[PDB]
């Protein structure tokens, strides 16, 4: 099948404004949220119907308890970072863990932390070591690496446990995650440019590029972002500037889910 990924995010805020939670955790399969928890609800809840229908309440009870403890552990860790940064005010602390099951069967695994939206600690499960960006992270690195069993534990979870959860969730929502909606591609004009527009496609992974007379134009092409339409499908575009003094053979190329598409502009 296609490449799929599972990942969990954590967010902590030291001095949040009134109403906003100081801890949030959301899980994703590909681009779909599957789980959620925050310091206000103090409950872990599904974010997808095919998650709520296939996981018994004892599952949500158990992980609610874990996240109440992890919420406190995250509060402790952020207090330690902000004290050693000598930073005052409200600051953020983020964590991302997950894995990918690639098309050819190979797997990847990642775990990293961020402070104020910047890389902080990056785990290398092949050298069993942590990468530190500054001397506050270097202090955390020496403490985490002194517990060799903790590094080994994460390596096993990324390579074995994460992949097994991903396969389990892939089956629960295969009607959503493994479907293909091919895109609707058109061209039009708009000082004159050509816009290649696609919409109504899933999965959101798509490649759009312009070609002039058969050669690629990577430096001159303007790429729009892949945006959610709100109905489970996505849209994107790619423009290019037309030469007013010479005619050329411009053709839009679209790649999506193993199908290549060409639109020649006449």
């Amino acid at each position: 099948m296609r490449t799929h990924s599972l990942r969990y995010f954590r967010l902590g805020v030291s001095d949040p404004i009134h109403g906003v939670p100081e801890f949030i955790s959301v899980g994703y399969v590909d681009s779909h949220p599957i789980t959620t928890y925050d310091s206000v609800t103090r409950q872990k809840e599904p974010r997808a119907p095919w998650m709520a229908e296939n996981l018994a309440p004892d599952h949500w009870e158990r992980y609610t308890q874990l996240l109440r403890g992890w919420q406190q552990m995250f509060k402790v860790e952020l207090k330690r970072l902000q004290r050693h940064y000598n930073h005052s005010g409200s600051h953020t602390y983020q964590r991302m863990i997950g894995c990918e099951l690639l098309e050819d069967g190979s797997t990847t695994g990642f775990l990293q932390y961020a402070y104020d939206g910047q890389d902080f600690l990056i785990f290398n499960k092949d050298t069993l070591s942590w990468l530190a960006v500054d001397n506050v992270a270097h202090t955390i690195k020496q403490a985490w690496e002194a517990n060799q069993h903790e590094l080994l534990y994460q390596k096993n979870w990324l390579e074995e446990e994460c992949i097994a959860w991903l396969k389990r969730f892939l089956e629960y929502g295969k009607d959503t995650l493994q479907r293909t909606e091919p895109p609707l591609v058109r061209v039009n004009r708009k000082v004159t440019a050509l816009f290649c527009k696609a919409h109504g496609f899933y999965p959101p992974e798509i490649y759009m590029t312009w070609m002039k007379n058969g050669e690629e134009i990577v430096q001159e092409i303007d790429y729009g972002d892949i945006l959610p339409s709100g109905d489970g499908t996505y849209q994107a575009w790619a423009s290019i500037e037309l030469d007013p003094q010479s005619s050329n053979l411009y053709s839009c190329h679209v790649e999506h889910s193993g199908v290549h598409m060409v639109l020649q502009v006449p």
Epitope: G69, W70, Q154
Partner: antibody, heavy 108, light 116 residues
Framework: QNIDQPTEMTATEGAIVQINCTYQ??????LFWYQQHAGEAPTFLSY??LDGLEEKGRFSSFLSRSKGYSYLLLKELQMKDSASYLC??????????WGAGTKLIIKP | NAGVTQTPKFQVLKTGQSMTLQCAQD?????MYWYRQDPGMGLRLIYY???????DKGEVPNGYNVSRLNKREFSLRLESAAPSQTSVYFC??????????????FGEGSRLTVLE
Amino acid sequence: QNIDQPTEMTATEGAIVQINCTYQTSGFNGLFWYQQHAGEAPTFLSYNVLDGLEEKGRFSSFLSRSKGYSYLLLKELQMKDSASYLCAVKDSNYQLIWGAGTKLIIKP
Amino acid sequence: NAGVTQTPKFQVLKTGQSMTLQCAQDMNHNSMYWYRQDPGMGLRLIYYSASEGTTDKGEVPNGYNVSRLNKREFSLRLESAAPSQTSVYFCASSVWTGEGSGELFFGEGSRLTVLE
């Protein structure tokens, strides 16, 4: 969920003894060995989560994730090693499953 | 420096009597547990406290209840004692729960015998 270890084992002072532990779990997050003398509290011995053998003094512990199998190797046995040795596996939800324990008897 | 302290070390009880077992730890741990040990079985969790301010049922919660008094103390409560509850009760603590390879630190143990 299932974990098994022999009820009781007898070896001679100065010999070597290997205490086995097999587990059938959904997911695996580590295997612990604990030592419990008669009438007292269990204390932590070793931890394995990746395959191989970890040596620590007279004791060493092995893990095979594929076979769902671990053993605790006690070398140069002494009378003070007479105790129960408990096996515990952490499952996919980080819940500990405990084996019944293995009472080790040392003949002097 | 005292580790895990639980009291009482021994107790006889008549069927239907109330009882409360105490457990404290001066190690600044967050997770605390109550186990019962029986001949021929592995340890069975009764109740656990992932951190201060939350508790949840274990494998055998019926006939028991708990109270995470604070960060240090986690007491096991028998409402109406029953002969099946005759057992050795162990309280344990760990730095965190579900966080990797953290081992358990056990208390000395509490031997309960319930008689008609």
